Amino acid sequence: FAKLVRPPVQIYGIEGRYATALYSAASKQNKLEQVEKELLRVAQILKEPKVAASIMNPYVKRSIKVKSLSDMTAKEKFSPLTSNLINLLAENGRLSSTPGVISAFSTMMSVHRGEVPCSVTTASPLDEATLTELKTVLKSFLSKGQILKLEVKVDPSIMGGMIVRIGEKYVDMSAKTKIQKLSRAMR
Amino acid sequence: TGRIVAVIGAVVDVQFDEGLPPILNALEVQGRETRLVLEVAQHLGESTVRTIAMDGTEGLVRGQKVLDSGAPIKIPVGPETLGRIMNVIGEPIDERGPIKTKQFAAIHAEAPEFMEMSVEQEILVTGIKVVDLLAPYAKGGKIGLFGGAGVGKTVLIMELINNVAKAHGGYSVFAGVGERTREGNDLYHEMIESGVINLKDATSKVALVYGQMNEPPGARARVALTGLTVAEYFRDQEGQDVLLFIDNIFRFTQAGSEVSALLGRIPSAVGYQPTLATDMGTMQERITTTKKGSITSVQAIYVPADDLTDPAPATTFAHLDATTVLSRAIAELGIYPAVDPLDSTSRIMDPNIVGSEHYDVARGVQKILQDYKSLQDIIAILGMDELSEEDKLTVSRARKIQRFLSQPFQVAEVFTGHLGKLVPLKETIKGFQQILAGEYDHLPEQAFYMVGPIEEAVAKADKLA
Amino acid sequence: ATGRIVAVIGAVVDVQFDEGLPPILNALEVQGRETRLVLEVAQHLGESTVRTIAMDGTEGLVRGQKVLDSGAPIKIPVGPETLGRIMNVIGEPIDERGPIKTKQFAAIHAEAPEFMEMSVEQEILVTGIKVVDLLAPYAKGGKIGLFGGAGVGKTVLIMELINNVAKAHGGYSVFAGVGERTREGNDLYHEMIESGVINLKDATSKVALVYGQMNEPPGARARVALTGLTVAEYFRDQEGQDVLLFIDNIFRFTQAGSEVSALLGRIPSAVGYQPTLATDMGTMQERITTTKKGSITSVQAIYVPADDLTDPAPATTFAHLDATTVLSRAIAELGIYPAVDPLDSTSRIMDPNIVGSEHYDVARGVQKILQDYKSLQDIIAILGMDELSEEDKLTVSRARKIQRFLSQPFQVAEVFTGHLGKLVPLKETIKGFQQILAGEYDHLPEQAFYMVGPIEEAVAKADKLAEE
Amino acid sequence: DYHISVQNMMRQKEQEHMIRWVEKHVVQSISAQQEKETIAKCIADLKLLAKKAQAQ
Amino acid sequence: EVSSILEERILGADTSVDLEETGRVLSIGDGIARVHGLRNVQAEEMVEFSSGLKGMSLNLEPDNVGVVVFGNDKLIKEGDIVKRTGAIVDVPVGEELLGRVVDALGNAIDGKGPIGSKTRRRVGLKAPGIIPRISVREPMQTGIKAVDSLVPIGRGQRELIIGDRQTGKTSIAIDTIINQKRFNDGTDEKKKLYCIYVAIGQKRSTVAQLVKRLTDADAMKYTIVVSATASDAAPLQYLAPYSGCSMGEYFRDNGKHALIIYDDLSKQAVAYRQMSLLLRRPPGREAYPGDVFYLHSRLLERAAKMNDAFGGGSLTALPVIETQAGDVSAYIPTNVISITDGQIFLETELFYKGIRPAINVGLSVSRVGSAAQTRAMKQVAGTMKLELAQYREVAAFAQFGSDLDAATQQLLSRGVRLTELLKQGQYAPMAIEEQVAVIYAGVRGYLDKLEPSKITKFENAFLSHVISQHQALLGKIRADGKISEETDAKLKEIVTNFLAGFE
Amino acid sequence: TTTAEVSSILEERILGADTSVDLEETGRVLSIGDGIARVHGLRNVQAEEMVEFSSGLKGMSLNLEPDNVGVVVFGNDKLIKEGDIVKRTGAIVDVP
């Protein structure tokens, strides 16, 4: 077995194996972007009333499903290796997990291009000046030739402080500060 | 170079990229103060190998790089391993500096081929009268040393080492499988006092391989193989009659069972590993007589629940060629060594192997001892005048025999002040034959206590009155 | 938060939520049921799906049925208003007397009292039973065990203890029937109604009842002990009065846990029990303790499967009890009731510094002579009784007299034996057993000591038999 | 020692009562304090910048 | 003052914030949390949840990290954040723990203020190797005549207290703890012994009773009570022996002598079995995991007697095993018997036969042997052991001993008197000189004429007499450590006079 | 998942390089361990047919799973590794 290119995230699960294999195959021949686009457009052609049905139906032969998908992917301009991936999923019966495979590969490619969102959850959003200030400070945290995404949340339970998860760090200056008052309560 | 992907218990899974190491290969974990050696046990697929650890797995992080050594666990071997204590992975643990040898040998080696096997049983003369007479040690065989503490087992081990070194010119290896650290230190210092191991010059006769109880089961599962490799070097590259000690084989079986259980393999009867017979065979078959030399193993045995039919003692007895049992009653009787003359048995105690004369002498000795047991029962019930003159003479001869089985030991000279004796087999046979023939019936009972050859017995009789 | 049922395998129901995932040990209300079905969250299976244990039958449930969350564990109606009222596992009244109108509700799951809250004092609770008050005395505010097999007399013994102690107890009492026969529950309810302990007409009742019987699903039988001990906890903490907590049988809690464990997704432990046996048993037992706020005297009946006390379920309970009373089948077959094993029962207060030198000496002498009798029985088996020496014949006779004098009729057992129930005071028991040890009654037949109270009754029976 | 123990117990009870009032009042007060919440939104942004400078 | 000190405490506490390593809880159940993420976590590393509960990352599976919870699992929800502490579990250590009751993590639970511990020591440190140890020679006086006579215990020896429930194991451990008072409050430093009692799977009321018993005897001032009660989570019960072992290792490394008593190691094994089964680790015999012998082996091997080069300290371990119906062939009893040096065997039959303590001298053994005894105690104990073995050989004929040989009757009488000597009351440990005097009065045939039932009264009266009037001889025996010929003659005179005057 | 659902086989399928390797008569070891070796391929192998490994050991095709073949190795499993090529002998296990 030839060695395969490991994706950066290295997700696990049934979709994990397929996503890792696809990432390794597309890294070879340098077709990551084309495969990613074909995956993001193949999910939409996997949610039609006719297409979504007859693949979750367990009483139709896999051969029928394989062909129904081979001709569909052929007429959908797909003639690289993504057609092979769809055919393999149809043959192995993991068709229901195909959206999960697409999501996993999308996350892998996102980590290849973007970064883990810096989730901030304090309260209702403040002024846009503070938003861009925190975006700039998060960029300074990253500062590795990369650009991070942002996800702002609202939490009434969290008091005047904020909690920020810059990647996998998750600093905490929030209602837990008032929890740390137990030290005075203890001794 | 692989990466750790699972640290479940003592079972560590490493995923490699370029080349998957074969099974039974030593993997060295990077980034740790002390060496952590992983032995490949399975190929799980997706370029992942499941390994058992030879040390604690705390502090291991998913993603730590592990280097494939390229061979099984290789230990330092050679004449310079004598007088040293080394663990399973071969590191010295006696704090006496590195063990500087010329070559290393992998612990996992195939059993000698069919042609290399010897085709003639031969008695390994240990210089001990009781052992060499009633339960002789076959050369390249396995001995089950029954009995625990209070019967001088360690003294017997040291004296066996000394006798084999002096007579056959062969070194000895003591591989303590699951040995207590306190008892390990006590045995080390006792051997130092006995002189079988010397810390000054290179006259030591024992190479110690200690796998303590606090080590993981994988370590205790391979300590026996480490000691066996140390003995194999002497057997092959030097052609010596090596003497291997395993204390004890039951803990080797237990370590194997624990290792198999950690790998999620369905256990066999009485909760033992499925590969009990095969693992025991792979361990024991390397203890044989090749054309270059031989390895003789004296393995201590603990019988769980006092049930000889348990899978571990049964599998062990499947490979034994003789048994020596140290009875506490004999020790209380004052006879050292405390080898029981009746319960000890040898498979080679056959006329075709030891000769007609030796077999006849040993059978006569055992018969006289059994008759003495019956007459002692009668004396316990009835009076000593009830038995006839023949019974009285048999009692006297049997007492003389069972006091002649006692023997001073060179390893005990410093303690008891009595010079040790290395009685040759011919002298033992001749003395016991003459005793059975009634030649020395006039000598007193104490004339045969704690002596070597029968000439020393007659000299001691002359000393008395 | 509304969730949907996705799996109804057995008594284990899997509910999938989308917005708010309930925490573990939360009561879930199943909508669309004619009765009230409560699911207790046991595991978080992931994917916003929780594995739950049903407190009632799962028949009729359909995948996709809506399930609400209470936001809190099972809350029972608690207070002084629950006296004389039988209530279900989830707190619903099952005595057909209307709702249990109370101002307080307490969750059946709560933390055990801390180390600083433990009370080290221990008095002696005289019960009137000769064996109990002599060899394994009970302590006020202490945990009491009634180990026994099937038919040895655990239920009768605990009923006699209720008769002797609960009526004389100034404080309240709680009975928590866990996984037992409904016939026994009805009998106890009617007996306490006619004994004045439970009064339907006015609010002078002194015993609360919590009943989950063997017809209930395993989820219910694994929580009724918690409900009863929660009522006891309220009577102990919120009110400073002393509490009596009678549980019969506590083994069904472990048995119910084992029954649900396999479907909960756990590798079976030894003898097929749940791996969390000791953990859950300790979590339940530590709550039943005497704190500084109040004292709970717990008399728990423990079923011993196959009369094998080495079974894990009864074995783990020994460390949780101060005084233990082991009823043995061999003694019961001899006709000696109660079947308390003199050489197996133990009590923490059995000590000369606590019960006095005389009591300890009498108890130890009784145990020693019974052990010597056990030793001599083997000799009698082969040698023969007539072939024994004259010295050990006296010991055997004294041991027979002591074995028969340990027996005692019970008020709750009048229907079976017909003898009048007796309640021997502690000093009378001590004096009688000391006199028997001294040989003062070696001239009386051993039959005179069988099923009698004080030693005076023994001599009266002896002379009455002599009259005939 | 009677007086000493009584005084110690009273001290402990006063301590627990005071901490109970403090912990039951601070949370609600700061929940009702928007003028302090807006500055608590920036007590850590400078601290975040300092922390990132430490990282970089 | 209270408000002022509270404000001083709160101003002293600094609310620092920093980066961390965090992960989400995929699935929480039965005290086991499957955590997604947490890539850089060491095996057996402490991690804290969002709710404040701590945990130990045991299974480092590829997709998730399995962590055990140090508390109730209801406070952990799916999706909660699990921070990384970054260090292997460690417990506070030092002299400050003396007189305190602490949990498995060292937190004070006696309500006597925080522990002033200045040092922090891990719980999984390796035991000392072959070289650092030395042969056990110094006695560890338990205060029980039977133990100190026939089953001696040295400093650095793992001696097992095995037996069924309600037999006196906890009583033996607690009187061993009490007996060490005479050495600790004295002046000889090399004789002081710091006891560490670890309670595993026992109700808090029992631990409170034990603590009160120790406090009444003034034994808490040198004793640490590590408590992991039945209410506590299984991981705490699993860790408690290791925490106590580390607390004893601190004394061992600093030249001091520590005594560690793992009460109910069987319950720790049960807790570890629960954790392993809930972690889906493969089971074995009696559902115990394969690495259950490892659990107790790597714990008890830490009990050792260091040589002078390493300080000369010691750590004596007294594990307690609760056998079921006296079945020593069970898994955990066999493991612990194999690991330890010897065992002190207690039997219910002997307990109710009047032989209290219930030590069965036939089955109780000590592999360290007489090397862990004083010369006087060894001298009397060899004779007592030989005579008791001879009696136990002929104990079958006691029922029909009247029509027996004169030698057999003499052996029966001597053995009965020695057995009556071995009996001892609870919470009444005896000094070594008192024990050696009693055993001397027994073995030398000064009790054969005396009635067997009157031995206990004679023993108590003789002890009172020798303590009151002949304190000089006892002091000389204690200081010298041997019963010399002059002391032998003095003891002969004293016992003869007291025996003559006893009637 | 399944034995042949591994990432390497999936990569071989999607890349289209499943044409050069002879899956009809040869196979590659997916997982060797516990004395049983799972082989991917050998589509034309027979039940109980003897197959020889790259190292030289011979094995018997015991289990013919839909995606793999369970081969018991007549020898030490140390000599067999993942990725080793297994080829048919075209004969049920026999003996001279």
Ligand SMILES: Nc1ncnc2c1ncn2[C@@H]1O[C@H](COP(=O)(O)OP(=O)(O)OP(=O)(O)O)[C@@H](O)[C@H]1O
């Ligand atoms: N030497 C003794 N003489 C008299 N009674 C004793 C003696 N030793 C212990 N006891 C009593 O025996 C009972 C059991 O003692 P202990 O609690 O030590 O036993 P255990 O087997 O360790 O207990 P458990 O199994 O419940 O943990 C107690 O009532 C105690 O007072």
Ligand SMILES: Nc1ncnc2c1ncn2[C@@H]1O[C@H](COP(=O)(O)OP(=O)(O)O)[C@@H](O)[C@H]1O
């Ligand atoms: N005084 C007594 N104490 C206990 N049991 C008695 C007594 N007298 C008679 N018995 C008999 O003992 C049996 C005990 O029944 P029960 O309490 O239901 O046992 P268990 O509760 O163990 O199933 C009864 O059937 C009864 O006939």
Ligand SMILES: [Mg+2]
């Ligand atoms: Mg009943």
Ligand SMILES: [Mg+2]
């Ligand atoms: Mg105890």
